[PDB]
A paper describes a structure:
Sulfur oxygenase reductases (SORs) are present in thermophilic and mesophilic archaea and bacteria, and catalyze oxygen-dependent oxygenation and disproportionation of elemental sulfur. SOR has a hollow, spherical homo-24-mer structure and reactions take place at active sites inside the chamber. Here, we report the biochemical and structural characterizations of SORs from the thermoacidophilic archaeon Sulfurisphaera tokodaii (StSOR) and present high-resolution structures determined by X-ray crystallography and cryogenic electron microscopy (cryo-EM). Each monomer has an 8-stranded β barrel core surrounded by 10 α helices.
Author numbering:
A (entry chain G), B (entry chain B), C (entry chain E), D (entry chain A): 2 to 311
Write the structure that this text describes.
Amino acid sequence: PKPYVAINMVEVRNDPKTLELFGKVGPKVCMVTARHPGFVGFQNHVQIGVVPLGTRWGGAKMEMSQEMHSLMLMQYTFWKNWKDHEEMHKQNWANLFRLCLQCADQMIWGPYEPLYEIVYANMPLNTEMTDFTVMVGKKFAAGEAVSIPPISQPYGKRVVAFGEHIVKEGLENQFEEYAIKTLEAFRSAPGFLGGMILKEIGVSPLGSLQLNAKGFHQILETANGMDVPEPVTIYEAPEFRNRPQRYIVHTEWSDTNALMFGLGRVLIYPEVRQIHDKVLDTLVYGPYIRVLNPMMEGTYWREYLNEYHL
Amino acid sequence: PKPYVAINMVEVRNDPKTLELFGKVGPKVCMVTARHPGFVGFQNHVQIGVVPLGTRWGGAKMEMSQEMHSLMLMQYTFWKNWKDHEEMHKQNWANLFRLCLQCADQMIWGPYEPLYEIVYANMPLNTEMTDFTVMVGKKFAAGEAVSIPPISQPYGKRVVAFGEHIVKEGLENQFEEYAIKTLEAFRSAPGFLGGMILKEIGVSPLGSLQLNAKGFHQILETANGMDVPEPVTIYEAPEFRNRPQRYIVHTEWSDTNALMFGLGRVLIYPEVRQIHDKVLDTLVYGPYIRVLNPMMEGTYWREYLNEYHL
Amino acid sequence: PKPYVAINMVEVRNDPKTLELFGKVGPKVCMVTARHPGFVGFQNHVQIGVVPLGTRWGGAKMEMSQEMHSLMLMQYTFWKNWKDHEEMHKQNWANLFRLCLQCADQMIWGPYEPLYEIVYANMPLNTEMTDFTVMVGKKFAAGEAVSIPPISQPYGKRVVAFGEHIVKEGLENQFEEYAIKTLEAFRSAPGFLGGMILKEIGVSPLGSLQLNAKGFHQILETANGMDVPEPVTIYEAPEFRNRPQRYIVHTEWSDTNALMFGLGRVLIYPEVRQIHDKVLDTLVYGPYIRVLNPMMEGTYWREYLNEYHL
Amino acid sequence: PKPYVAINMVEVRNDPKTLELFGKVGPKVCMVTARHPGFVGFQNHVQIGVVPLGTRWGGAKMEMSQEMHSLMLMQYTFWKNWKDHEEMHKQNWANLFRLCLQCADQMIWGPYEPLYEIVYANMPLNTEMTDFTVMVGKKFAAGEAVSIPPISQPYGKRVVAFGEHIVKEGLENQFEEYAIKTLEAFRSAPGFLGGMILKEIGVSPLGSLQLNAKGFHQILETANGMDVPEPVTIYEAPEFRNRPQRYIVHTEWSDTNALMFGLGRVLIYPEVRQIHDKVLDTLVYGPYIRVLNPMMEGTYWREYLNEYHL
Ligand SMILES: [Fe+3]
Ligand SMILES: [Fe+3]
Ligand SMILES: [Fe+3]
Ligand SMILES: [Fe+3]
């Protein structure tokens, strides 16, 4: 079934010290998160660029990463129920807070952790190029040759388009209908690996290090987290539901050229342009498309979604 | 009286080509804006850093600017009525659109242009060090020695703290009361040059290049703006009023040390810490404090605010 | 009272030999000029740049001086009566001519020496930063706190805007009225140090090395001025009064940023733009604004103007 | 009213790692200290040199800092009652101990934290150069033109003379009388910014990491303070009151030349030399004068002392 998604957003220094530190701390955070039986996996991204749409963001490129002093991270965790994420943070607050503060000397902004429901998902199981023989054999044996997925390679071997959209009050149904029809049209595009539409439903206070005044002071005063703030918040996640309605349109692509020309169908393929025009007519903000590299992931989140495995 | 504020937010390449281009285009945009009789001046900023609050954002510094591949700009325009800003953009769309696109090859994100009401302002006239004799003489002649302002030097010779806050629904009155009391306490801090509290009331669609589908395509297709999009929007500014309520707490300081230790009173001076704790107990997001350099400005916005001049 | 002004204009090589030579000869010319009891002081300038007004003169900058192979000098002398200047040149012709020819191997153009009446002056006494205590004390003791001037620092520690204007026949009264109202509006601008409006009334033949044919040959033939031309002219200064009417709008500023944003009020502050539009509607030429550095000066010309001293 | 003073004394490596670490840890220690309502502010110093008094310490200079492998820090905290300091250390022992040990790899000697009563204080509010207009205006409006203080700039923009004195038993009253008369004479010296006389009344055991045997072992054995020693001491602060009586004569100066020639009045101005000779006749040790730079400070301690603010 469809999980719920938490996206931990942080901006960190683009330094070898930061790469090394996150490679040591990130796995520990995933191990703590996996103490909760509602956790069904994760997908961690580094922003590598921006889709320029001709010259609209002419200072940007799809691969800018080398040039940048900081990195935006978008760390997705997947949950059977969105309250499972909030419960996991409360139950594991001390260990999580301490791991979060190991990243302290590297952080510029965040963490900020919006929570999402999935409106639509066409997200296949990941497979390595070594695995396609197994996937083809098992799909043929089940009489499902017609629904064999593309090869969506894990661990940094494909790219993500992270499309930010904010929708005028009352046009949410129109946005969802025509964003789904757009993602269905992308199934024709070479190197399309799937997509999903995320609808923001709140912001995690503990995931965002947002406490009451006493907690805020304890966060600032702690010697590397040894001194644990009391995790008392002034809100619960649904009380920070941004309006107007935020969506992320998340698509996955073999590489940045497939992304550019595949997403480009909304501009250059008249029949797809007509569908996506209905999406554009709902927006107060966007589209703004970040290019992400999905580096570290727990691909079993898609086994939960699709209710099968290889 | 209190003007309304539009803050044009953009992220641009940190290049000599971008510095030169903005120094040529920026003044022209100000001249077009000044065609509207509701325009009362402007204050343009470049973000130079982040207040780290000890190690909370330990990868940031108050002066990071040299290290960065891109710059955030926050370009304030001041208006007798917020609708004057919307009318100016509509009446001058072609010339503004074309100037905005000269910056095209330098832009990474934006423009995004929220509109604000001023809740509170203690913002003196700017003066050069050469002017303090005039300011002192005129104040003494009026028997107003008690209200002589500090010397708030224009054109890059002071710094700004840009404090982002998002307030839980129903706690806006509490936030405003205690944010005002905090800014009043800052009058005791060495190098405090004034502050104001901005309350977000909408987002300018034309200022944010947010049009209907037809307009969006014309923006992407134009050869440097010669081809002018039809400025038809799917919303007006009040239909993009973010909830929960956004505020900017804008303070001005002689230098970054005065900023750090002056703002720091909310953490290290017990009587001020007790005031600001009431602000902290209202927040769903923040505080997050950007350090800005106010470079190009039309200081006469403060003549409008304070209803006098030297 | 208002003196009359002679502005000796020359273009010289931008060389260390030229800087050294002018530093030795300039003071001697001032000492010769001071033989005449009508001489009330001087203010010598080097042009350092041009106000570009956005991209209108996009090859220019306010500080270009380093990049230039030649320098324009504008050497102001101040006189109780304009005929005093002409009498001084006639009475001191040999010594002045010989000092002028010491600069010979450095001159590219000039000298050209227009004469001016002052239409309007708001030009304070100069003071060093060490003097402001005296200036404040003396003004307070006189009950004149309201009219304390800004600190207008002498000897290269401020900048000058030299605004060239040529006015259509019959629109001189309109030009003068609204140029005065513009300079009055500049009193509100940070770092404004005063201004004056100069109206060209003739050209000095002896100051311009303009003699009859016999004199011209003696100028060309002289061995460094030992051989003195007979100072016979074919005109007197009022017979070279340019039409249409030339004006210089001379303003003084703390620094080039204060100059750019202060003069900029005629473009970006709607109420001042409306005043200065009446000036623009009188022009056949201009505005063209040179940026000058007032290096060597006899500040006592302002003691004569203002009829007081510290 | 007069606060009491704790001076935390440590010697640390003069390394970029030590500068960075103290810039991150110091603010956190101040925030923990500010949990106690008796805390009224702080003034942290780095020793930059020694007053050589001709050739008496001829190997020393007033600015030696660049040449040195280690730095002496003198971190002043100010308290309504000296017991407030002892209570703050006891109540916040775990968080303070952990922050103190983050500095561990940089420490050579200390911490050693004597406690003081203020015998005499002439210590103005600090002001930035931007603030002097406000300070002058508010003092004139209060009828206190006669008592306007000098501009004592915060955050590393002045220097401190830290004068060590030890007084023969029975000569304390003579020392205090003539040390006060000496500091009154310094009001005549250019660049004098105030002074105070501190009389040592004890040593903080917790501030000095002086515990019983069990605590000492736990201090040595702790993994970076995670393992918290039991804060059991063998003495209270008044049981480590050094005899004979220690004083610090603390004076503040615009710069090191004003310090040298201003303090020098006790040697070179006969009438002041006669006053200070009465101080010299009381000493068993001293004077020994360290030159300090007051870098990070909570200037509101002077608002408590003087019972007003700007
Ligand atoms: Fe989370
Ligand atoms: Fe705008
Ligand atoms: Fe002349
Ligand atoms: Fe202590």
